[PDB]
Short mmCIF file of all heavy atoms in Angstrom, two decimals:
data_model
loop_
_atom_site.label_atom_id
_atom_site.label_comp_id
_atom_site.label_asym_id
_atom_site.label_seq_id
_atom_site.Cartn_x
_atom_site.Cartn_y
_atom_site.Cartn_z
N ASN K 130 0.81 -1.21 0.00
CA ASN K 130 0.00 0.00 0.00
C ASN K 130 0.86 1.27 0.00
O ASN K 130 0.56 2.22 -0.73
CB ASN K 130 -0.98 0.04 1.18
CG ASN K 130 -2.10 -0.97 1.10
OD1 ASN K 130 -2.07 -1.87 0.26
ND2 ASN K 130 -3.08 -0.82 1.97
N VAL K 131 1.88 1.33 0.86
CA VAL K 131 2.76 2.50 0.92
C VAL K 131 3.45 2.74 -0.44
O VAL K 131 3.66 3.89 -0.84
CB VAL K 131 3.86 2.38 2.00
CG1 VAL K 131 4.94 3.42 1.83
CG2 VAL K 131 3.30 2.43 3.41
N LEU K 132 3.90 1.66 -1.09
CA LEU K 132 4.53 1.80 -2.39
C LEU K 132 3.53 2.33 -3.42
O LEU K 132 3.90 3.10 -4.29
CB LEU K 132 5.10 0.45 -2.83
CG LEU K 132 6.31 -0.04 -2.03
CD1 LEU K 132 6.54 -1.51 -2.32
CD2 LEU K 132 7.56 0.76 -2.39
N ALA K 133 2.25 1.92 -3.32
CA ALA K 133 1.23 2.43 -4.24
C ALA K 133 1.06 3.95 -4.09
O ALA K 133 0.98 4.72 -5.06
CB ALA K 133 -0.04 1.68 -3.96
N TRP K 134 1.07 4.39 -2.83
CA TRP K 134 0.91 5.79 -2.53
C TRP K 134 2.10 6.62 -3.03
O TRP K 134 1.93 7.77 -3.42
CB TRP K 134 0.70 5.90 -1.02
CG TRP K 134 0.57 7.29 -0.47
CD1 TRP K 134 -0.53 8.09 -0.47
CD2 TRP K 134 1.58 7.97 0.28
NE1 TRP K 134 -0.25 9.25 0.20
CE2 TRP K 134 1.03 9.21 0.67
CE3 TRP K 134 2.90 7.66 0.64
CZ2 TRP K 134 1.75 10.13 1.42
CZ3 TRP K 134 3.61 8.59 1.37
CH2 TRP K 134 3.04 9.80 1.76
N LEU K 135 3.30 6.06 -2.99
CA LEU K 135 4.46 6.75 -3.54
C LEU K 135 4.28 6.90 -5.06
O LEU K 135 4.65 7.93 -5.60
CB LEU K 135 5.75 6.02 -3.16
CG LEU K 135 6.09 6.09 -1.68
CD1 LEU K 135 7.38 5.35 -1.40
CD2 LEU K 135 6.17 7.53 -1.19
N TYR K 136 3.66 5.93 -5.72
CA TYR K 136 3.39 6.05 -7.15
C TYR K 136 2.36 7.16 -7.39
O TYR K 136 2.57 8.04 -8.23
CB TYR K 136 2.92 4.72 -7.74
CG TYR K 136 4.01 3.77 -8.10
CD1 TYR K 136 4.24 2.60 -7.37
CD2 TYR K 136 4.82 4.01 -9.21
CE1 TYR K 136 5.24 1.71 -7.72
CE2 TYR K 136 5.82 3.13 -9.57
CZ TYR K 136 6.03 1.97 -8.82
OH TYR K 136 7.03 1.11 -9.20
N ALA K 137 1.27 7.13 -6.63
CA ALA K 137 0.30 8.22 -6.64
C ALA K 137 1.00 9.56 -6.50
O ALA K 137 0.60 10.52 -7.18
CB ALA K 137 -0.73 8.07 -5.55
N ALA K 138 1.99 9.66 -5.61
CA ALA K 138 2.68 10.92 -5.40
C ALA K 138 3.38 11.34 -6.68
O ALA K 138 3.25 12.49 -7.09
CB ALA K 138 3.67 10.83 -4.25
N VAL K 139 4.12 10.41 -7.30
CA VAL K 139 4.89 10.72 -8.50
C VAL K 139 3.95 11.22 -9.61
O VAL K 139 4.23 12.25 -10.21
CB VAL K 139 5.75 9.52 -8.95
CG1 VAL K 139 6.29 9.68 -10.36
CG2 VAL K 139 6.88 9.25 -7.96
N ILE K 140 2.85 10.49 -9.82
CA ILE K 140 1.77 10.84 -10.72
C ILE K 140 1.33 12.29 -10.48
O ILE K 140 1.22 13.03 -11.46
CB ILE K 140 0.61 9.84 -10.59
CG1 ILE K 140 1.01 8.46 -11.14
CG2 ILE K 140 -0.66 10.37 -11.25
CD1 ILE K 140 -0.07 7.40 -11.05
N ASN K 141 1.15 12.70 -9.20
CA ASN K 141 0.67 14.04 -8.88
C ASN K 141 1.80 15.06 -8.78
O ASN K 141 1.54 16.22 -8.45
CB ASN K 141 -0.19 14.08 -7.62
CG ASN K 141 -1.58 13.55 -7.89
OD1 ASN K 141 -2.36 14.20 -8.56
ND2 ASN K 141 -1.87 12.34 -7.45
N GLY K 142 3.05 14.66 -9.02
CA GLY K 142 4.14 15.60 -9.18
C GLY K 142 5.07 15.75 -7.98
O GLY K 142 6.01 16.53 -8.06
N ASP K 143 4.82 15.04 -6.86
CA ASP K 143 5.77 15.03 -5.75
C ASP K 143 6.86 14.00 -6.05
O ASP K 143 6.58 12.80 -6.07
CB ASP K 143 5.13 14.67 -4.40
CG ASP K 143 4.33 15.78 -3.74
OD1 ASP K 143 4.22 16.86 -4.34
OD2 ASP K 143 3.81 15.55 -2.62
N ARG K 144 8.08 14.49 -6.32
CA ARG K 144 9.14 13.63 -6.81
C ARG K 144 10.40 13.77 -5.95
O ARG K 144 11.30 12.95 -6.09
CB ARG K 144 9.45 13.97 -8.28
CG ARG K 144 8.58 13.27 -9.32
CD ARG K 144 8.84 13.81 -10.73
NE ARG K 144 8.39 15.20 -10.88
CZ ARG K 144 9.14 16.29 -10.68
NH1 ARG K 144 10.45 16.19 -10.51
NH2 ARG K 144 8.58 17.49 -10.61
N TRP K 145 10.44 14.76 -5.04
CA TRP K 145 11.64 15.05 -4.25
C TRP K 145 12.21 13.79 -3.61
O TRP K 145 13.43 13.67 -3.47
CB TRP K 145 11.38 16.15 -3.21
CG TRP K 145 10.40 15.78 -2.13
CD1 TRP K 145 9.10 16.17 -2.05
CD2 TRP K 145 10.65 14.98 -0.97
NE1 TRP K 145 8.51 15.64 -0.94
CE2 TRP K 145 9.44 14.91 -0.25
CE3 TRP K 145 11.77 14.30 -0.47
CZ2 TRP K 145 9.32 14.19 0.94
CZ3 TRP K 145 11.65 13.58 0.70
CH2 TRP K 145 10.44 13.54 1.40
N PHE K 146 11.35 12.84 -3.22
CA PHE K 146 11.77 11.64 -2.49
C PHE K 146 12.39 10.59 -3.41
O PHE K 146 12.95 9.60 -2.93
CB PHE K 146 10.58 11.03 -1.75
CG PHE K 146 9.49 10.55 -2.67
CD1 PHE K 146 9.56 9.31 -3.29
CD2 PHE K 146 8.39 11.35 -2.93
CE1 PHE K 146 8.55 8.87 -4.13
CE2 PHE K 146 7.37 10.91 -3.76
CZ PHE K 146 7.47 9.68 -4.38
N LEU K 147 12.23 10.74 -4.73
CA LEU K 147 12.90 9.85 -5.66
C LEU K 147 14.42 10.07 -5.57
O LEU K 147 14.92 11.14 -5.91
CB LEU K 147 12.43 10.14 -7.09
CG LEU K 147 11.04 9.65 -7.50
CD1 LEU K 147 10.75 10.10 -8.92
CD2 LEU K 147 10.91 8.13 -7.37
N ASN K 148 15.14 9.05 -5.10
CA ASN K 148 16.59 9.14 -5.06
C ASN K 148 17.16 8.29 -6.19
O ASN K 148 16.42 7.56 -6.87
CB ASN K 148 17.14 8.71 -3.70
CG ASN K 148 16.74 7.29 -3.33
OD1 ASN K 148 16.86 6.36 -4.15
ND2 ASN K 148 16.27 7.13 -2.11
N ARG K 149 18.49 8.35 -6.32
CA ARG K 149 19.22 7.81 -7.46
C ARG K 149 19.85 6.45 -7.13
O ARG K 149 20.72 5.98 -7.87
CB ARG K 149 20.26 8.85 -7.89
CG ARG K 149 19.77 9.83 -8.95
CD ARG K 149 19.59 9.08 -10.25
NE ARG K 149 19.25 9.90 -11.40
CZ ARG K 149 18.03 10.37 -11.65
NH1 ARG K 149 17.11 10.36 -10.69
NH2 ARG K 149 17.73 10.86 -12.84
N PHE K 150 19.37 5.78 -6.07
CA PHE K 150 19.88 4.49 -5.64
C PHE K 150 18.89 3.39 -6.03
O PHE K 150 17.77 3.68 -6.45
CB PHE K 150 20.17 4.54 -4.13
CG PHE K 150 20.84 5.82 -3.69
CD1 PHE K 150 20.10 6.89 -3.22
CD2 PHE K 150 22.22 5.98 -3.82
CE1 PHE K 150 20.71 8.08 -2.85
CE2 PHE K 150 22.83 7.17 -3.44
CZ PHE K 150 22.07 8.22 -2.96
N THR K 151 19.36 2.14 -5.97
CA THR K 151 18.53 0.96 -6.19
C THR K 151 18.77 -0.05 -5.08
O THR K 151 19.61 0.14 -4.21
CB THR K 151 18.84 0.24 -7.52
OG1 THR K 151 17.70 -0.59 -7.77
CG2 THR K 151 20.11 -0.59 -7.48
N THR K 152 18.03 -1.16 -5.12
CA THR K 152 18.17 -2.20 -4.13
C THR K 152 17.57 -3.49 -4.70
O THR K 152 17.02 -3.50 -5.79
CB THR K 152 17.51 -1.76 -2.80
OG1 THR K 152 17.82 -2.72 -1.78
CG2 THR K 152 16.01 -1.60 -2.92
N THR K 153 17.67 -4.55 -3.91
CA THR K 153 17.12 -5.85 -4.24
C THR K 153 15.90 -6.07 -3.34
O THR K 153 15.76 -5.37 -2.33
CB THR K 153 18.20 -6.93 -4.05
OG1 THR K 153 18.44 -7.08 -2.65
CG2 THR K 153 19.51 -6.59 -4.72
N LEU K 154 15.07 -7.05 -3.69
CA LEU K 154 13.87 -7.38 -2.93
C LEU K 154 14.25 -7.81 -1.51
O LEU K 154 13.65 -7.34 -0.53
CB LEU K 154 13.05 -8.44 -3.71
CG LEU K 154 11.87 -9.09 -3.00
CD1 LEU K 154 10.87 -9.69 -3.99
CD2 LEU K 154 12.34 -10.17 -2.04
N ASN K 155 15.29 -8.66 -1.38
CA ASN K 155 15.73 -9.18 -0.09
C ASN K 155 16.39 -8.09 0.77
O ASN K 155 16.20 -8.06 1.98
CB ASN K 155 16.64 -10.40 -0.24
CG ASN K 155 15.90 -11.70 0.01
OD1 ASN K 155 16.35 -12.52 0.82
ND2 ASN K 155 14.77 -11.88 -0.64
N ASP K 156 17.15 -7.21 0.14
CA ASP K 156 17.80 -6.12 0.86
C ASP K 156 16.72 -5.26 1.51
O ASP K 156 16.82 -4.92 2.69
CB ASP K 156 18.69 -5.28 -0.06
CG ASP K 156 19.64 -6.09 -0.91
OD1 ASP K 156 19.90 -7.27 -0.56
OD2 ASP K 156 20.09 -5.56 -1.96
N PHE K 157 15.72 -4.90 0.69
CA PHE K 157 14.60 -4.08 1.11
C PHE K 157 13.89 -4.72 2.30
O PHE K 157 13.75 -4.08 3.34
CB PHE K 157 13.59 -3.86 -0.03
CG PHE K 157 12.32 -3.19 0.44
CD1 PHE K 157 12.30 -1.83 0.71
CD2 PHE K 157 11.20 -3.95 0.75
CE1 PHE K 157 11.15 -1.23 1.22
CE2 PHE K 157 10.06 -3.35 1.26
CZ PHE K 157 10.04 -1.99 1.49
N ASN K 158 13.45 -5.97 2.15
CA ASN K 158 12.70 -6.68 3.18
C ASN K 158 13.45 -6.68 4.52
O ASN K 158 12.81 -6.55 5.56
CB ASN K 158 12.35 -8.11 2.74
CG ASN K 158 11.19 -8.12 1.77
OD1 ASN K 158 10.43 -7.16 1.68
ND2 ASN K 158 11.03 -9.23 1.07
N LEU K 159 14.79 -6.79 4.49
CA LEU K 159 15.58 -6.86 5.71
C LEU K 159 15.66 -5.46 6.35
O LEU K 159 15.87 -5.34 7.55
CB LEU K 159 16.95 -7.47 5.38
CG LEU K 159 16.92 -8.84 4.68
CD1 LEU K 159 18.31 -9.44 4.54
CD2 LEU K 159 15.98 -9.83 5.38
N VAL K 160 15.42 -4.41 5.56
CA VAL K 160 15.17 -3.09 6.12
C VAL K 160 13.71 -2.99 6.59
O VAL K 160 13.46 -2.48 7.68
CB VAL K 160 15.52 -1.98 5.12
CG1 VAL K 160 15.04 -0.61 5.60
CG2 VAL K 160 17.02 -1.95 4.83
N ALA K 161 12.76 -3.47 5.76
CA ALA K 161 11.34 -3.43 6.09
C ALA K 161 11.09 -4.01 7.48
O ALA K 161 10.42 -3.37 8.29
CB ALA K 161 10.53 -4.15 5.04
N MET K 162 11.63 -5.21 7.76
CA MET K 162 11.42 -5.91 9.02
C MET K 162 11.91 -5.05 10.18
O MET K 162 11.21 -4.91 11.18
CB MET K 162 12.17 -7.24 9.03
CG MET K 162 11.63 -8.27 8.05
SD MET K 162 9.83 -8.20 7.81
CE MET K 162 9.75 -7.46 6.18
N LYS K 163 13.08 -4.44 10.03
CA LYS K 163 13.66 -3.60 11.07
C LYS K 163 12.72 -2.46 11.44
O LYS K 163 12.86 -1.88 12.52
CB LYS K 163 15.01 -3.02 10.58
CG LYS K 163 15.61 -1.88 11.39
CD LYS K 163 16.98 -1.41 10.88
CE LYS K 163 17.04 -1.27 9.37
NZ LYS K 163 18.04 -0.26 8.93
N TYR K 164 11.82 -2.09 10.52
CA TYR K 164 10.99 -0.90 10.67
C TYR K 164 9.51 -1.27 10.82
O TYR K 164 8.65 -0.40 10.79
CB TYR K 164 11.25 0.02 9.48
CG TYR K 164 12.49 0.87 9.63
CD1 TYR K 164 13.66 0.57 8.94
CD2 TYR K 164 12.50 1.94 10.50
CE1 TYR K 164 14.79 1.36 9.09
CE2 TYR K 164 13.62 2.73 10.66
CZ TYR K 164 14.77 2.44 9.96
OH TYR K 164 15.88 3.24 10.15
N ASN K 165 9.24 -2.55 11.06
CA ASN K 165 7.85 -3.04 11.28
C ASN K 165 7.02 -2.83 10.01
O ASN K 165 5.89 -2.35 10.11
CB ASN K 165 7.22 -2.43 12.54
CG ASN K 165 6.77 -3.49 13.51
OD1 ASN K 165 7.59 -4.27 14.00
ND2 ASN K 165 5.48 -3.53 13.80
#
């Protein structure tokens, strides 16, 4: 849901949070878990 809302943001022109980095699904999840 949060990722959907970030897409909504981009669509509506809020882009400041788009950074120039990438990640993997597993890397992300291991951050996700740390943050509930």
Side-chain angles (χ1 to χ4, degrees):
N130 290 12
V131 167
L132 290 165
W134 177 81
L135 291 181
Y136 277 109
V139 166
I140 291 180
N141 284 288
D143 283 2
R144 274 172 293 92
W145 65 258
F146 63 83
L147 285 177
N148 59 46
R149 269 291 186 282
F150 317 93
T151 198
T152 188
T153 71
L154 171 159
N155 258 232
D156 310 341
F157 171 77
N158 283 341
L159 305 187
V160 170
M162 292 326 106
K163 167 177 44 153
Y164 279 104
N165 238 61

